Amino acid sequence: GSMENFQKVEKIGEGTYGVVYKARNKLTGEVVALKKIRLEGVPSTAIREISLLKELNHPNIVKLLDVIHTENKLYLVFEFLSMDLKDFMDASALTGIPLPLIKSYLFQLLQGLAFCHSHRVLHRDLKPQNLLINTEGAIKLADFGLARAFGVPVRTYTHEVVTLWYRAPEILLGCKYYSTAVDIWSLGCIFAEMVTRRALFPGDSEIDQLFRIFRTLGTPDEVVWPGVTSMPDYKPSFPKWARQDFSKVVPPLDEDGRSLLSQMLHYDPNKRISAKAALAHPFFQDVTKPVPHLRL
Amino acid sequence: PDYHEDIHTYLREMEVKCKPKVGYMKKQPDITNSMRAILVDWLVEVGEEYKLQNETLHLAVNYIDRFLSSMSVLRGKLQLVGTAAMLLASKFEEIYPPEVAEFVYITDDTYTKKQVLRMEHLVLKVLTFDLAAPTVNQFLTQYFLHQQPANCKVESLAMFLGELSLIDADPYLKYLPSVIAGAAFHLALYTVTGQSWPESLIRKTGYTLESLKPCLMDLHQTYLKAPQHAQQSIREKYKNSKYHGVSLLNPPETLNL
Ligand SMILES: Nc1ncnc2c1ncn2[C@@H]1O[C@H](COP(=O)(O)OP(=O)(O)OP(=O)(O)O)[C@@H](O)[C@H]1O
Ligand SMILES: [Mg+2]
Secondary structure, three states, X not given: OOHHHEEEEEEEXXXXXXXXXXXXXXXXXXXXXXEEEXXXXXXXXXXXXXXXXXXXXXXXXOOEEEEEEOOOEEEEEEEOOOEXXXXXXXXXXXXXXXXXXXXXXXXXXXXHHHHXXXXXXXXXXXXXXXXXXXXXXXXXXXXXXXXXXXXXXXOOOOOOOOOHHHOOHHHHOOOOOOOOHHHHHHHXXXXXXXXXXXXXXXXXXXXXXXXXXXXXXXXXXXXXXXXXXXXXXXXXXXXXXXXXXXXXXXXXXXXXXXXXXXXXOOOOOOXXXXXXXXXXXXXXXXXXXXXXXXXX | OOOHHHHHHHHHHHHHHOOOOOOHHHHOOOOOHHHHHHHHHHHHHHHHHOOOOHXXXXXXXXXXXXXXXXXXXXXXXXXXXXXXHHHHHHHHHOOOXXXXXXXXXXXXOOOOHHHHHHHHHHHHHHOOOOOOOOOHHHHHXXXXXXXXXXXXXXXXXXXXXXXXXXXXXXXXXXXXXXXXHHHHHHHHHHXXXXXXXXXXXXXXXXXXXXXXXXXXXXXXXXXXXXXXXXXXXXXXXXOOHHHOOHHHOOOOOOOOO
């Protein structure tokens, strides 16, 4: 694995580390994505991303193929996928996304996430921009720069986490502990977004985010979420919104889809469904894996 | 909850894959177990100075032992390996790792920032970026969930004993982290409450007192001899109220095993 064997094609994105390039292996023909690091030493994000991806070999997790070094550059060589889910939803603006594909993608995301969690990895940045799709119908978790290896039981970890629209209420309310449930919350938001093609909770601040969630699911009390009124960032002045008809949250969903979404968006992280358990939900009784309905 | 069993199983797989070479010190021409003990004791002090997690210390030691399993190192460079290992462990594990400048400072200007950063790169290359290693600490926190009921002195004492094991390559390099954790948990439980390795942990781990006996016999001796050990930073650390002053507790004279 060396840089002389790769021919750069085009820019395909931007991240930390910086720009991401599509490239071609001149000898095998393999198309790859190249993530470049300029060399405080090696960035902690890169250390975590590489170490964790090397453990996480699964069909629904982006594959790290190689790490190419130099004194002054570090290249991460990944399998190439044609599009992210955000770009796919934008491409589906007037068609919508076929239900069999929404179901397939959610099932695959749950598989990838269950694998992460069973290997003590929290992703902590699940959003459509970080989910990559290929021409054969696969969807894969990507961008593990914000991930971390967790302990059993968890201790307090970074409080920054998850991009705001996809951030779980336990993070927003400042709980000392969060765990795997934070990723399930994000996937629930993503499930809703696949169906409506708009973000479920598009807040601009932490408090706006919380209030958007409360207006959709009701303001939680001690019955629905024991301990909530004692959480660090809970305020007794919070408006107490009624929980609306859950069928109105994502109107196209039918009984099984609603059931699954409601379990992913449970306030109490203890009660919120695990990725492993969600795989067996009746929503997936007829799941298949078709190719995308659009050219990528 | 849903993942406790899966994670334990995975960590049991990975501790075998992440284990350093048991006989490596015999292959090191210039360094000894004593020099290693000095280094690890210093890392404990660094962890104290910068209020680092215990997990960070345990990771750094794993990195050092794996590094020394394939790389010959002169005694004058041993601290540079340790410094880079601690920097890497901090970047991996800590919310707020100390800045590189801070690691340079605690070497007492023995090394330059460039040396530390070049060593960081070398350690990553030698370890092939495989930093998510299971530690004694990771097994201990799982075992603690089996207390009936939870006891802070037991937890801190188990952590103390697990940490003492980091200092002495002979004999502890021969035991897996899950086994050292088992011995430490039993010894702590027995010292504080008079209880023994619980049956629920036999079901979880497959270990019995019989299987833990060789490690437990070693750990008991280390515990009995701890006040006389050349290295004392761990004993000093565990006097703190943060760890419930557990290094002040008297070790049991016998175990009945
Ligand atoms: N293996 C890959 N194949 C194809 N495209 C990729 C690959 N990895 C990353 N990308 C592209 O790079 C974009 C952003 O990179 P990435 O998500 O890794 O970092 P990021 O820090 O989240 O970026 P940003 O902060 O701008 O969202 C993605 O939307 C994706 O389209
Ligand atoms: Mg020697």
